[PDB]
Ligand binder design. Structure first.
Ligand SMILES: CCNC(=O)Nc1cc(C)on1
Ligand SMILES: CCNC(=O)Nc1cc(C)on1
Lengths: 265, 263
């Protein structure tokens, strides 16, 4: 729970809780996602945000997720101490980037890593806008000046166009609804719930024999508190790959589209 | 994260996480419920468990029968909350687990909980009366004198809960658990039932009142592939009667009561 020596990144340690683990006695993908969100919120708070800046609050602007990419090598067990390091970076006028590094506190080894793309949006009109110079200045003094990427790769999985799932979907999970636990302090559906909804259409047999290694997820539209989501999946592929689609049950309005990679246990 | 000086209770501190808070910027009832479960699991682990040597041999496990939680002040995001838990025996009826919620800064009691646990065979799901051999290995970790978080004889935690009669005033149907709701043994987490109970409370009541008390009976377990209907009726401060039942046959899984205060 502290900024690093240069104040250009934040570090936090977590002990994995009993209710945070799944069938394999290891932290669920949603627990990891929540832990990334927690270390990110505290980083924004430790430098004077609320993650809006002074100019963003004046112009009724907020940061919204556009893409999420998480890769796990080892899921921490119940009781294990995991340490996460996060940092923000500017992507010119497209928006901002937030990266994460997951580590084992005992061995120091990197057991996972994440990256997210954030676009600026007017709170009310919901219209995405390009980042102005005045706002870009207010967050550049908290970002590393040299590019520091959790996924440095010359042609990585985090920056690839995701196709649209064509009907009929191989697998599906219908009538998914958020509850009050899924909503945040601003009554909006938590970004992590969409990850959990995406994986609900993965069959229970794949979950019992494989471990989720990678998950890329695009956030096309928000699901309202009183909305109902349909989760769709199709095997595309020792490794399994799937195409995903979250859409509103009625009109079929797309809210999310993603991909997952799984490996044998 | 340590047993107290006498080793007859466990204490643990928690910093309230950003995703654990609701609209009012304070910890949700399910976050508190999860924090009670966490401190309870660690207490069982710190003493060698929550099944025991003879319980494993007989294919026996502890199941919740009743939950009673009272909150006076919900902790804010960033606040440090300290919980103290302890186990006690209830003859051969079962076991009891109590909790005390406190503010780490002021030391004030901001909440308290109590739960009744029944002995069940994991396979046949039959309730077994607790034997003398298992009560001996459980008594060495319990206070010998009765220590009750709700000492009031015949209070809100020990009262018969009636069955909600149709038509329910409010309802929330088609509730389903996801993988996040299942525990390491693939069973639906006890806290999900609390959240499902409160889903039938209207959004207007939540926006103007705070949940002060919640008593909840656990009649039957909801399977991974099951669908629940949540029912509520105002009986009254606001009071409600609750009923969780399976969507199809209407099989009762839970019944409870909630008390709310104006903000
Ligand atoms: C400054 C706040 N940062 C975030 O909210 N980060 C995340 C991470 C995930 C996952 O969802 N939100
Ligand atoms: C020894 C394990 N104790 C519990 O599981 N306690 C709880 C508390 C709540 C709530 O649900 N389970």
């Amino acid at each position: 729970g502290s900024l690093t020596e240069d104040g250009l990144s934040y570090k936090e340690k977590f002990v994995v809780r009993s209710y945070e683990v799944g069938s394999n006695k290891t932290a669920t993908v949603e627990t990891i996602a929540n832990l990334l969100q927690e270390v990110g919120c505290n980083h924004a708070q430790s430098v004077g945000f609320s993650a809006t800046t002074t100019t963003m609050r004046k112009l009724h602007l907020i940061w919204v997720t556009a893409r999420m990419h998480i890769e796990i090598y080892k899921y921490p067990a119940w009781g294990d101490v995991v340490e996460i390091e996060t940092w923000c970076q500017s992507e010119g006028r497209i928006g901002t980037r937030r990266d994460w590094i997951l580590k084992d506190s005992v061995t120091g080894e990197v057991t996972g890593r994440a990256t997210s793309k954030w676009v600026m949006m007017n709170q009310d009109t919901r219209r995405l806008q390009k980042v102005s110079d005045d706002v870009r200045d207010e967050y550049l003094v908290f970002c590393p000046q040299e590019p520091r990427l959790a996924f440095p790769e010359e042609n990585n999985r985090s920056l690839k166009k995701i196709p649209k799932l064509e009907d009929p979907a191989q697998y599906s999970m219908i009538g998914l609804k958020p509850r009050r636990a899924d909503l945040d302090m601003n009554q909006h559906v938590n970004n992590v719930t969409y990850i959990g909804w995406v994986l609900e259409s993965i069959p229970q047999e794949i979950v019992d024999t494989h471990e989720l290694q990678v998950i890329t997820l695009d956030y096309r539209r928000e699901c309202q508190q009183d909305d109902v989501v349909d989760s769709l999946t199709t095997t595309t592929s020792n490794d399994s790959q799937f195409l995903h689609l979250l859409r509103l049950s009625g009109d079929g309005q797309e809210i999310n589209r993603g991909t997952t990679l799984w490996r044998k246990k």
